[PDB]
RNA sequence: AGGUUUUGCGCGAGUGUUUGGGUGUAAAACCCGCACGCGUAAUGAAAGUGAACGUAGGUGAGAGCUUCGGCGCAUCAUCGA
RNA sequence: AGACUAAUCGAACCAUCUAGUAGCUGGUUACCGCCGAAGUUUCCCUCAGGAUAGCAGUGUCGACCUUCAGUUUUAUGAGGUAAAGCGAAUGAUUAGGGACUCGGGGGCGUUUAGCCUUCAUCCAUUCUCAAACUUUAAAUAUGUAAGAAGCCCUUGUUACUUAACUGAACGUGGGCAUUCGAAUGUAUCGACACUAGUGGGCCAUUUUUGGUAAGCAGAACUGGCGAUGCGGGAUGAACCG
RNA sequence: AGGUGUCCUAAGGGGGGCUCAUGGAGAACAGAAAUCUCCAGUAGAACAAAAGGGUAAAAGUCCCCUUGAUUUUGAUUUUCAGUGUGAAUACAAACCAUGAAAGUGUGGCCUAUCGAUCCUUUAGUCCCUCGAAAUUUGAGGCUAGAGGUGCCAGAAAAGUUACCACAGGGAUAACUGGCUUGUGGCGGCCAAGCGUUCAUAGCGACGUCGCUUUUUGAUCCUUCGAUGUCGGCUCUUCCUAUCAUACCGAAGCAGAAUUCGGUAAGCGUUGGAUUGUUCACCCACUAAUAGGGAACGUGAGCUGGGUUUAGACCGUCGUGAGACAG
RNA sequence: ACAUACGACCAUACCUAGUGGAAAACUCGGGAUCCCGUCCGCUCUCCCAUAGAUAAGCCACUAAGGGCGGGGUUAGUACUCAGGUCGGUGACGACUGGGGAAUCCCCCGUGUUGUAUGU
């Protein structure tokens, strides 16, 4: 027999029952999808920055 | 019925009246940085890098910069949750957003207001207030005699 | 009507231990009194952790204690509301004073042989009623086989429920491109 | 019919397994019988050890 | 009730019939009140209305509990950092819309009034202008407060 | 669809790793072997009584096939396969239009 | 019977006596150990190979301690090994 | 005659396999307390059924972090519906005028641009229209933002980029507040685990589509009944309170 | 209202020169239309194919060169469970095409043009295994394509039952009732026209407003653990939209006979041939032989003529079993 | 201020018609060996900067010019959000609290500006 085809009648209320969850933002976003050349350079830039920061405490004194 | 990619984009993706043809080059001359806030507006004359019709008229944050396109983060409402979508959009469909210009002008105005208030010894108001009810005032009818109005009688005009 | 979204909402945290251990009940009474009559947040944290289930009190090993004993923490009293276990990988146990819910036999023996000291939580309450000069440690909560299975789904890299491991168990059609698609 | 995240069931009970269930309520009685047999055979092998080298 | 007026009434703290609140008139509050016009009657209170509301139906929100204002110690304990240490101070702050009006009004638990002693107009769910009781009746809310309080 | 008899494209051959010339032919499926494990299992299952033990497809719907180009490198004879779209009529080396 | 998650227990890098043996006030209780199961290492179809640059790393948080300078549990995000 | 074969025949009777299977019908046993739905998404020889997500309960844990919001304000984007238009494009359509010289036909005094006429074209006007027309273009509704993960100064790293330290990204060090940079609320924030029922819906305002219409069939938003008593509408699932 | 299962070595890629549909003037054959020239010409052309966007020193058109329709693996977008599949977008590894370059190019300007497991067949290498040890055949693995499931998330599949069976369904048809009233029936308003003369004695077009539920449709709300399904006979009552009878008004009412209308359902409305009929049509009488409802009134009232299970015949149909609102 | 080159906005800049244009620039211009390309040195390419001319391009001004742009009027009209046990047989309408258009028509205007080198 025939029946109802489709409906969105109750969906808004069901969605709002426990709130519309918006994923919280973070200080450091994922570098996924970023330009691989930029990622490759950024890796070594971070390496050098950490090395320089450690030498600063150990006697480099920048 | 159909559910193709560009279904229902007859007017949204079309170029306006007397807006066809050559694309201004300031679009290509603009520069974008990661973290910039951009408005997405699909240009119908550029079929490469076209975002889906959902992202037309949406505002997002640039998360990736490439040769001729930018990656934009948008938040899309599906069912009871928000999904973080990442779209690669060519520059022709991207415009820098004024959605933060008021705040970006207010921050520096507040900085100067703070330094001037500290110099002058009197605090000022940094936060914006909503429109307040009008204060008491006097209206003089000298040379402004009120004009008495009455409702007009009905008559046909055809 | 009053038009409230929430009514009769119960607190979602434990208010007492589900355990029937008599000595744990006595310890809970002691630390209830301490948390009521002292300003120290340490006592309240200890009291709340005394209610917790075993999976909420993962074990802390001697090596985990030794990691946190570094960088100016050598003379602090280590407080673990959990079981303290031994670690074979740690060959030299540093001198330490540890108060824990319980110790394994090997952990207690090695702590005492290294010149250290072992305390119960009531002894800790006696000597440091406010938790002064204490280092409060927790074990790895997620380091558990069951957690590896939680949230299994596409592109989530969790552990599936399988009876065995091998080429014939969940490794074809849905896991490689040579068999249709991968996950 | 699976309904959640379950390990795929493979319980081999599709035959008439109840027809061949082997309980072990006779474990202590069988142990007693074994001890009695051992004692009897040790008595029979009066000075000899109960086993072979 | 539609969800937007429901949310606005929840934000105005008018969660129950015959609940009453003091609101400082700005554009932001006026627009919300205009939206929830089909559910509220509002107006301009006088000193007598403010005084009697605070004195008879005055309850403070102390640690999430509704505590009657039977002593000045409660008011000093919960509003003393703003210079409000007495019920007359609270009345003055509300009536004059002082710099700490937000704190004073939010400290006041929403007033729980009775039905008016003389009743409402013959049909109370029209606008006051149409002959009902909804909307802005301006100074005429003082008679309604006197009946409802 | 008309494709040329030759084309130069990337060659994965260990010595080439480079765009080289390739001769183009049409891939043809080889004759089915009687000693493949699937064929052996099918014969063993079909032996005896029981009738047809595996499904036999009947509801054919395609009127075309995907043409596969077999490319043979001119320097190392390394072979590569390039699938094309479905087309009813296919020829290679046909006369060009004017 | 098998599986799973969550409670409460014992022991804990181990754990499980009870297939079996010893013993008995005799289907109980008590005692014993070789093997074995699970765990301690993964990955690949397989041959096979097999986990520290760092005080077991850096950044942002983070309860609790602090000699008030920072030390930073669990956990989360992130860049690395 | 599908007739008869012990009141049994389109395959007798007896026992067993067998407690055969059933997405189908019926039933399913004390009390109180708290919370509390769905008839919708995707896939299925799926359409009286399942799985999947959603709605729900319970158990927790985390600093319950000073954040969160079916809301307003302010600033800034997108849209092509209502309306409007056709002396604006496309398409439809009613009427006359001005001329053309001819543009077709037919004539009058024949290469006479002779003089007429009947249409056609053109032109400046005119009446009326469009779900698959539009130069315009609302209301409602919708994206983003309103700080500490911010702002300002100085100079460190790189294998990327630039002609180049010149940029990009991430930082060190220093500074800000006589005010953490709209309103209102916060009568609850977040994460995790396991699982129930449901997956026939129906009614109403507004907007509607098919239909002559229907207590008809199908949709969008919201509110209801289902799951709900009470006052009113005499009488009632939905109406008013 | 339509479209798709294709088609293209160019209709893919790069570069350059040019500007299209059409109109007005002109030029032997030549005219409405062949070619040539100029001037206008916002695209009114063209771009494989539906429609909608888009494009003018191009995305059109012609010319030159080519194979980016290539290799490798990820990220993202739409449909979405944020799973497949199909499509699509930006970037990296490479080595190629083209232009002096800049740059562009990962098939078709964009929105459709397609396919899992198992099996099979190819392509790929000093690759792995055949488990007592070797070599050579053979076989089996790993990575990437192809052979196809159009019911397109993908079974291998002809009928009949009137001899029929079971679990159910009023989620779903046939009969009553319910809503509706297109259709059927019955009225009104207007009044061109007819009526010798005269629109309105009496008819009456085009249009338009209604009523009724004695037609038939439309719907599927009630009933499928059953409300006995046509007609007739018998019997009672009700309705009025009156056939006759009572009393009235109007006429194209001299009388007679008629016609129209009002108050009116009190009282009647028949006997037969044919047909199961309903409906109908004839014969005849009569004041008249009006129309309807009451679960299409009425089967524990009848009857069983009709519909009509099982027997049987014919015609048409079917290979057949069998079908037929014959 | 004017000219040129490269632009930005992309008609207030377009289209039609008339008048005028210091200096320099731009332009038309002359020749066809070489480079190059055509049916044709028309275009493109090369060479000359002498000569001639502002006729055209270009610039400026003009036109109760067409168009375009801005404003008004249309109009608090059309429309629309929320409300009532409002009206009306209905179609639909009015009112309450808000938001609020578009033609015809009328008036004004007909480019602004950056970098560099020049007059
Ligand atoms: Mg059905
Ligand atoms: Mg359904
Ligand atoms: Mg919940
Ligand atoms: Mg109550
Ligand atoms: Mg993914
Ligand atoms: Mg294969
Ligand atoms: Mg395969
Ligand atoms: Mg059985
Ligand atoms: Mg009274
Ligand atoms: Mg009243
Ligand atoms: Mg073979
Ligand atoms: Mg045989
Ligand atoms: Mg069990
Ligand atoms: Mg062991
Ligand atoms: Mg191994
Ligand atoms: Mg702290
Ligand atoms: Mg028969
Ligand atoms: Mg018998
Ligand atoms: Mg018989
Ligand atoms: Mg038989
Ligand atoms: Mg039997
Ligand atoms: Mg409740
Ligand atoms: Mg199937
Ligand atoms: Mg049922
Ligand atoms: Mg439109
Ligand atoms: Mg539309
Ligand atoms: Mg309209
Ligand atoms: Mg028109
Ligand atoms: Mg037209
Ligand atoms: Mg329209
Ligand atoms: Mg708008
Ligand atoms: Mg907005
Ligand atoms: Mg469920
Ligand atoms: Mg379903
Ligand atoms: Mg379900
Ligand atoms: Mg239903
Ligand atoms: Mg309906
Ligand atoms: Mg229905
Ligand atoms: Mg129900
Ligand atoms: Mg109710
Ligand atoms: Mg009632
Ligand atoms: Mg009803
Ligand atoms: Mg169709
Ligand atoms: Mg093309
Ligand atoms: Mg080409
Ligand atoms: Mg080309
Ligand atoms: Mg070109
Ligand atoms: Mg076009
Ligand atoms: Mg070449
Ligand atoms: Mg996809
Ligand atoms: Mg494409
Ligand atoms: Mg490239
Ligand atoms: Mg395939
Ligand atoms: Mg097959
Ligand atoms: Mg194979
Ligand atoms: Mg071998
Ligand atoms: Mg096949
Ligand atoms: Mg399917
Ligand atoms: Mg029904
Ligand atoms: Mg009718
Ligand atoms: Mg008449
Ligand atoms: Mg009917
Ligand atoms: Mg029915
Ligand atoms: Mg029935
Ligand atoms: Mg019944
Ligand atoms: Mg009966
Ligand atoms: Mg009869
Ligand atoms: Mg009558
Ligand atoms: Mg009569
Ligand atoms: Mg009678
Ligand atoms: Mg009837
Ligand atoms: Mg009947
Ligand atoms: Mg009867
Ligand atoms: Mg009967
Ligand atoms: Mg009958
Ligand atoms: Mg009969
Ligand atoms: Mg018969
Ligand atoms: Mg018959």
Automatic annotation (TrEMBL), chain B:
GO cellular component: ribonucleoprotein complex; ribosome
UniProt entry keywords in alphabetical sequence: Ribonucleoprotein, Ribosomal protein
Example GO BP: translation
Gene Ontology MF term list: structural constituent of ribosome
Top-level taxon: Eukaryota
Family matches, as InterPro entries: Ribosomal_eL21, Ribosomal_eL21_CS, Ribosomal_eL21_sf, Translation_prot_SH3-like_sf
Family, as annotated: Belongs to the eukaryotic ribosomal protein eL21 family.
Name of the protein: 60S ribosomal protein l21-like protein
Naturally occurring in which organism (per UniProt): Chaetomium thermophilum (strain DSM 1495 / CBS 144.50 / IMI 039719)
Automatic annotation (TrEMBL), chain D:
An individual GO BP term: translation
Ribonucleoprotein keyword on record: yes
Coiled-coil ranges from the UniProt annotation: none
Statement: the UniProt record of this protein carries the keyword Metal-binding: no
Signal sequence, renumbered to the chain: none
Gene Ontology CC annotations of this record: cytosolic large ribosomal subunit
Keywords (A to Z) from UniProt: Ribonucleoprotein, Ribosomal protein
Molecular-function GO term, any one: structural constituent of ribosome
Family: Belongs to the eukaryotic ribosomal protein eL13 family.
Protein name per the record: 60S ribosomal protein L13
Residues of the full protein shown: 2 to 54 of 213
TrEMBL record, chain E:
Residue positions binding Mg(2+): 122
Domain of life: Eukaryota
Any one GO molecular-function label of the UniProt entry: structural constituent of ribosome
One annotated Gene Ontology cellular component of this protein: cytosolic large ribosomal subunit
A GO biological process held by the record: maturation of LSU-rRNA from tricistronic rRNA transcript (SSU-rRNA, 5.8S rRNA, LSU-rRNA)
Keywords recorded for this protein, A-Z: Metal-binding, Ribonucleoprotein, Ribosomal protein
Keyword GTP-binding: no
Domain Large ribosomal subunit protein uL30-like ferredoxin-like fold: 1-40
Entry keyword Mitochondrion: no
Family membership noted in the UniProt record: Belongs to the universal ribosomal protein uL30 family.
Name listed for the protein in its UniProt record: 60S ribosomal protein l7-like protein
Included stretch of the parent chain: 101 to 249 of 249
Automatic annotation (TrEMBL), chain F:
Matching PANTHER family: 60S RIBOSOMAL PROTEIN L36A/L44
A UniProt-annotated Pfam family: Ribosomal_L44
GO CC, alphabetical: ribonucleoprotein complex; ribosome
Keywords, comma-separated and alphabetical: Metal-binding, Ribonucleoprotein, Ribosomal protein, Zinc
Any GO molecular function: structural constituent of ribosome
Family per similarity comment: Belongs to the eukaryotic ribosomal protein eL42 family.
Superkingdom in the source lineage: Eukaryota
Biological processes, Gene Ontology terms: translation
Keyword Ribosomal protein among UniProt keywords: yes
UniProt lineage: Eukaryota, Fungi, Dikarya, Ascomycota, Pezizomycotina
Protein name: 60S ribosomal protein L44-like protein
Binding of Zn(2+), residues: 11, 16, 73, 76
Gene3D superfamilies: 3.10.450.80
């Amino acid at each position: 027999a025939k029946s109802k085809n489709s409906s969105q009648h109750n969906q808004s209320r069901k969605a709002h029952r426990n709130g519309i969850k918006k994923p919280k933002t973070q200080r450091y976003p994922s570098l996924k999808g970023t330009d691989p050349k930029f990622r490759r350079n950024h890796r070594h830039a971070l390496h050098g920055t950490a090395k320089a920061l450690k030498e600063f405490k150990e006697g480099k004194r920048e | 019925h159909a559910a193709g990619l560009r279904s229902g984009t007859r007017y949204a993706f079309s170029r306006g009246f007397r807006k066809h043809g050559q694309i201004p080059l300031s679009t290509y001359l603009r520069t974008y940085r990661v973290g910039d806030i951009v408005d997405i507006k699909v240009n119908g004359a550029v079929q490469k890098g076209m975002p889906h019709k959902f992202y037309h008229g949406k505002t997002g944050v640039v998360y990736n910069v490439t040769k001729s396109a930018v990656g934009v983060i948008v938040y899309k409402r599906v069912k009871h949750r928000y999904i973080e979508k990442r779209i690669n959009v060519r520059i022709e469909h991207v415009k820098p957003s004024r959605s933060r210009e008021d705040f970006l002008r207010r921050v520096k105005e507040n900085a100067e207001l703070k330094k001037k208030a500290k110099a002058e010894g009197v605090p000022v108001q940094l936060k914006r207030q909503p429109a307040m009810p009008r204060e008491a005032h006097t209206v003089s009818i000298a040379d402004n005699k009120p004009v008495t109005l009455a409702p007009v009688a009905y008559e046909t005009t055809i | 009507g009053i038009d409230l979204r929430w009514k009769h909402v119960r607190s979602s945290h434990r208010k007492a231990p589900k355990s029937d251990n008599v000595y744990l009940k006595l310890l809970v009474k002691l630390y209830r009194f301490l948390a009521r009559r002292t300003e120290a947040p340490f006592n309240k944290v200890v009291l709340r952790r005394l209610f917790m289930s075993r999976i909420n009190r993962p074990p802390v090993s001697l090596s985990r204690i030794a990691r946190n004993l570094k960088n100016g923490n050598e003379k602090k009293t280590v407080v673990v509301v959990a079981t303290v276990t031994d670690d074979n990988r740690l060959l030299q146990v540093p001198k330490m004073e540890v108060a824990a819910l319980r110790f394994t036999a090997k952990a207690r023996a090695r702590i005492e042989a290294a010149g250290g000291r072992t305390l119960t939580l009531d002894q800790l309450a006696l000597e440091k009623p406010t938790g002064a000069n204490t280092l409060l440690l927790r074990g790895p909560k997620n380091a558990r086989e069951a957690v590896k299975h939680f949230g299994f789904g596409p592109h989530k890299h969790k552990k599936p429920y399988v009876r065995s491991k091998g080429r014939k168990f969940e490794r074809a059609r849905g896991r490689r491109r040579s068999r249709g698609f991968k996950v | 019919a699976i309904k959640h995240n379950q390990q795929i069931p493979n319980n081999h009970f599709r035959k008439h397994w109840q027809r061949r269930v082997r309980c072990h309520f006779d474990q202590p009685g069988k142990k007693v019988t074994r001890r009695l047999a051992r004692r009897a055979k040790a008595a029979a092998l009066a000075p000899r050890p109960v086993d072979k080298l | 009730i539609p969800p937007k007026p429901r949310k606005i009434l929840q934000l105005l703290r008018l969660r129950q019939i015959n609940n009453g609140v003091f609101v400082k008139v700005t554009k932001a509050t006026a627009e919300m009140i205009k939206i929830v016009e089909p559910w509220v009657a509002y107006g301009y209170p006088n000193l007598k209305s403010v005084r009697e509301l605070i004195y008879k139906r005055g309850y403070g929100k102390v640690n999430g509990q509704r505590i009657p204002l039977t002593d000045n110690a409660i008011i000093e304990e919960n509003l003393g950092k703003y210079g409000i240490i007495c019920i007359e101070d609270l009345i003055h702050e509300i009536f004059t819309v002082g710099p700490n009006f937000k704190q004073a009004a939010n400290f006041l638990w929403p007033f729980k009034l009775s039905n008016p002693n003389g009743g409402f107009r013959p049909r109370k769910f029209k606008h006051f202008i149409e002959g009902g009781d909804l909307g802005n009746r301006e100074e005429h809310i003082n008679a309604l407060i006197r009946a409802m309080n | 669809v008309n494709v040329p008899k030759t084309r130069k494209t990337f060659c994965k051959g260990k010595d080439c790793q480079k765009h080289t010339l390739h001769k183009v032919t049409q891939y043809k499926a080889g004759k089915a072997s009687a000693f493949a494990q699937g064929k052996r299992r099918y014969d063993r299952k079909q032996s005896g009584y029981g009738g047809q033990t595996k499904p036999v497809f009947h509801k054919k719907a395609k009127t075309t096939k995907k043409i596969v180009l077999r490319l043979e490198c001119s320097v190392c004879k390394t072979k590569k396969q390039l699938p094309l779209k479905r087309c009813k009529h296919f020829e290679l080396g046909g006369d060009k239009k004017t």
